[PDB]
């Protein structure tokens, strides 16, 4: 339960740093949970060395006893009633309608996952793009209308996977609108840009850690309503240290080490508003983690899905959109903690590239992470 | 300070401006204070509790502006930083929120009197003005609780003393305010101290003397309906002050 959440998060964070490292100075949002989720589904379609590589890299086998039920329980907990139209997630695997499927695959897939692999005719290229994107649109309730990468879809395409997520959370304690002011943000190249930054004074879970190379960095926790989710902000103390110092040492276990070390402290926080949207071609990041066969036309083994085949993944995409602003309409019942103290509060100013992590606190699931290089 | 007016240090010549130097050498303003004797500034414990090391602080007397010099001002190191051992914080209240700072210049001297550097008097034990009395508060605190900036110039405003029965009402603060604290507010809630104002003085006329009646401590929001400013009641702390000013 917490277990498959640890394993999914560990795996998904590993994929994130492959994407973060391949775009050093670009904004990135990504879902570690989402990528784990779709690849757990894909496991069932694979055989031989292809299956082996996915299992080895992910750290678990979907057919292992208790695993599929555990992932099912995880899903219900994440998409529970706490969600005030804040989060949407969708997984989908599209296979050529024409292909003869192994007997008992679809019922087995439905049993373990309570959804179906979608059968689409790729020889109607324009219609295939429409279908795939329409799936993304309805299951993100319109927040994500389209993918760019579906342009690679082809009459000879046989297998596609997609994952899309939207998040706009309601803070336990809103940032007051009056406090939102324009402020200088220091980009990694040394240039500055004027950018709207929210401000709020209250009691935040906070901790300071050290890199292996000796460098200090802040971690703050901003809880969403009812404390079901939190956002973590992490950034080096000194302007000269690049954000890469942090992302190079990122792991799921480090995130929870940060959380376990936190103490609630009165602070004034200045944080940029941001809206990021990233479409990630999953091929390279997954290849770097050892999953090379699944993308190779003749080497790929999807014989658990269909056996008369050359069959491989032509396209694997994730698309994520996140909004961070002041708002907080609270499904939170514990009145409110405030800073009553009238000293000038100690300030934490986030005015240089920072990373963020959105987590589900009861399970420890890393739902989202990213780097904001420029708000 | 919410509301009120810009003032000068000559109008508040006991006012002390207290700053902390961070790691890496930057210097920020933390709290107000009040000069009670040549070598002693009185303030609030919560200002210093998280950084209790005397070497981190700078105290100014005769300072009229936040980030520039005033002619006649004196700069001081803290030779001794005394916090109250019974200080604690509940959900809201700060208890025994009172501190003492012993000051020393680089040339090794205490405060030297002038037009802009004066001591304020202490009340006598348990001696307070009646509820309803108009008193004055001063500081470099925020003009609005949602502001990021602090005013460059010192501010002052008038507030009225409010009884413990009225302050201890459930829609006010309940049992969060003790008899060791004092509440003051505007009748129309247009005027109050705020963040950056802690440690500073609540000044009342008492038996023909300009008297340190309270020390800015805490409140819920600044200038909020049924949420008065809350002040350390100085007249309940004289044995503490007197014993600790010996050293």
SS3 state at B241: helix
Resolution (A): 2.3
Q: Does A342 touch chain B (CB under 8 A)?
A: yes
Q: Do B44 and A343 touch (CB under 8 A)?
A: yes
CA distance linking residue A275 with residue A141, whole number of Å: 18
Q: Do A345 and B31 touch (CB under 8 A)?
A: no
Torsion angles phi and psi, residue A217, rounded to 5: -150, 140
Torsion angles phi and psi, residue B63, rounded to 5: -95, 125
One domain for residues B44 and B80: yes
One domain for residues A93 and A108: yes
DSSP secondary structure code for residue B66 in this structure: S
One domain for residues A122 and A192: no
One domain for residues A46 and A114: yes
Which residues, other chains included, contact B46 with Cβ-Cβ below 8 Å and sequence gap of 6+? A341, A343, B87, B89, B94, B97, B198, B217, B218
Q: Do A341 and B46 touch (CB under 8 A)?
A: yes
Report residue A112 as tokens.
């373990």
Q: Contacts of residue A338 in chain B, CB cutoff 8 Å?
A: 92, 220-221
Q: Contacts of residue A201 in chain B, CB cutoff 8 Å?
A: 195
Secondary structure in 3-state letters for chain A:
CHHHHHHHHHHHHHHHHHHHHCCCCCCEEECHHHHHHHHHHHHCCCCHHHHHHHHHHHCCCCCCCCHHHHHHHHHHHHCCCCCCCCEEEEEEEEEECCCCCCCCHHHHHHHHHCCCCEEECCCCHHHHHHHHHHHHHHHCCCCCCCCCHHHHCCCCCCEEEEEEEEEECCECCCCCHHHCEEEEEECCCCCEEEEEEEEEEEEEEEEEEECCCCCEEEEEEEEEHHHCEEEEEEEECCCCCCCHHHHCCCCHHHHHHHHHCCEEEEEEEEEECEEEEEEEECHHHHHHCCCCHHHCCCCCCCCCCCCCCCCCCCEEEEEEEEEECCCCCCCCCCCCCCCCECCCCCEEECCCCEEEEEEECCCCEEEEEEEECCC
CATH of the domain at B24: 2.40.10.10
Comparing alpha-carbon positions, the chain A residue that sits nearest to B44 is: A343
Owner of token pair 């509790």: B49
One domain for residues A156 and A304: yes
One domain for residues A116 and A181: no
Tally of domains in chain A: 2
Q: Contacts of residue A347 in chain B, CB cutoff 8 Å?
A: 28
One domain for residues B152 and B30: no
Handedness of CA B230, B234, B240, B245 (dihedral sign): positive
Q: Contacts of residue A334 in chain B, CB cutoff 8 Å?
A: none
Q: Do B198 and A341 touch (CB under 8 A)?
A: yes
Write out the DSSP string of B22-62.
PTTS-EEEEEEEEEEETTEEEE-GGGTTTS--GGGEEEEES
Q: Which of B96, B99, B148, B195 to mutate to test the interface with A (most CBs of A within 10 A)?
A: B148
* Structural domain harbouring A82: 29-166+277-321+332-342
Nearest to A181 by CA among A260, A292, A91, A272: A272
Q: Contacts of residue A340 in chain B, CB cutoff 8 Å?
A: 92-94, 218-220, 230
Q: Do A343 and B198 touch (CB under 8 A)?
A: yes
Enumerate residues 154 to 213 of chain A having a beta carbon within 8 A of any beta carbon in chain B. Answer: 176, 178-179, 181, 199, 201
One domain for residues B67 and B141: no
One domain for residues A87 and A154: yes
One domain for residues B106 and B66: yes
Owner of token pair 């190249």: A189
* Structural domain harbouring B107: 13-119+236-247
SS3 state at B174: helix
One domain for residues A251 and A176: yes
Nearest to B61 by CA among B80, B49, B78: B78
One domain for residues A158 and A93: yes
CATH of the domain at A93: 3.30.497.10
């Amino acid at each position: 339960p917490s277990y498959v959440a640890h394993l999914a998060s560990d795996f998904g964070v590993r994929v994130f740093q492959q994407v973060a490292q391949a775009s050093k100075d670009r904004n990135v949002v990504f879902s570690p949970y989402g990528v784990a989720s779709v690849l757990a589904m894909l496991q069932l379609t694979t055989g031989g060395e292809t299956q082996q590589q996915i299992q080895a890299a992910m750290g678990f086998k979907i057919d292992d006893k208790g695993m599929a039920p555990a992932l099912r329980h995880l899903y219900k907990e994440l998409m529970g009633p706490w969600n005030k139209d804040e989060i949407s997630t969708t997984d989908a695997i599209f296979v050529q309608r024409d292909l003869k499927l192994v007997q008992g695959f679809m019922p087995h897939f439905f049993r373990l996952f309570r959804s179906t692999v979608k059968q689409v005719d790729f020889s109607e290229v324009e219609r295939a793009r429409f279908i795939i994107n329409d799936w993304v649109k309805t299951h993100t309730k319109g927040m994500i209308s389209h993918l760019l990468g579906t342009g690679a879809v082809q009459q000879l395409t046989r297998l596609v996977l997609v994952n899309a997520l939207y998040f706009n959370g309601q803070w336990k304690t809103p940032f007051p609108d009056s406090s939102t002011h324009r402020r200088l943000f220091h980009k990694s190249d040394g240039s500055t840009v004027s950018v709207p930054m929210m401000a709020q004074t209250n009691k935040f879970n906070y901790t300071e850690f050290t890199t292996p190379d000796g460098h200090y960095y802040d971690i703050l926790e901003l809880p969403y309503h009812g404390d079901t989710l939190s956002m973590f902000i992490a950034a080096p103390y000194e302007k000269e240290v690049p954000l890469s110092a942090l992302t190079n040492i990122l792991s799921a276990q480090l995130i929870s080490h940060w959380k376990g070390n936190m103490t609630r402290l009165p602070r004034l926080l200045v944080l940029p508003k941001f809206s990021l949207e990233t479409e990630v071609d999953l091929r390279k990041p997954l290849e770097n983690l050892g999953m090379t066969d699944m993308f190779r036309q003749f080497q790929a083994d999807f014989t658990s899905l269909s056996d008369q085949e050359p069959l491989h993944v032509a396209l694997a995409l994730q698309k994520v959109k996140i909004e961070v602003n002041e708002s907080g309409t609270v499904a939170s019942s514990s009145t409110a903690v405030i800073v009553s103290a009238r000293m000038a509060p100690e300030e934490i100013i986030i005015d240089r590239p920072f990373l963020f992590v959105v987590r589900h606190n009861p399970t420890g699931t890393v739902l989202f992470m990213g780097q904001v290089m420029e708000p | 300070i919410i509301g009120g007016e810009f003032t000068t240090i000559e109008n508040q010549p006991w006012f002390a401006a207290i700053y902390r130097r961070h790691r890496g050498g930057s210097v920020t303003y933390v709290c107000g204070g009040s000069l009670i004797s040549p070598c002693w500034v009185i303030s609030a414990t919560h200002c210093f509790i998280d950084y209790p090391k005397k070497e981190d602080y700078i105290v100014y007397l005769g300072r009229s502006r936040l980030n520039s010099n005033t002619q006649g001002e004196m700069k001081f190191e803290v030779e001794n930083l005394i916090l109250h051992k019974d200080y604690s914080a509940d959900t809201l209240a700060h208890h025994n929120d009172i501190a003492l700072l012993k000051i020393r210049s680089k040339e090794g001297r205490c405060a030297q009197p002038s037009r802009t550097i004066q001591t304020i008097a202490l009340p006598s034990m348990y001696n307070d003005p009646q509820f309803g009395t108009s008193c004055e508060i001063t500081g470099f605190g925020k003009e609005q609780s949602t502001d990021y900036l602090y005013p460059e110039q010192l501010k002052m405003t008038v507030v009225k003393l409010i009884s413990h029965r009225e302050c201890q009402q459930p829609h006010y603060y309940g049992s969060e305010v003790t008899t060791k604290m004092l509440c003051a507010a505007d009748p129309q809630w247009k005027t109050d101290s705020c963040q950056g104002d802690a440690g500073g003085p609540l000044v009342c006329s008492l038996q023909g003397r300009m008297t340190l009646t309270g020390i800015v401590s805490w409140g819920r929001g600044c200038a909020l309906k049924d949420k008065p400013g809350v002040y350390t009641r100085v007249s309940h702390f004289l044995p503490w002050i007197r014993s600790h000013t010996k050293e």
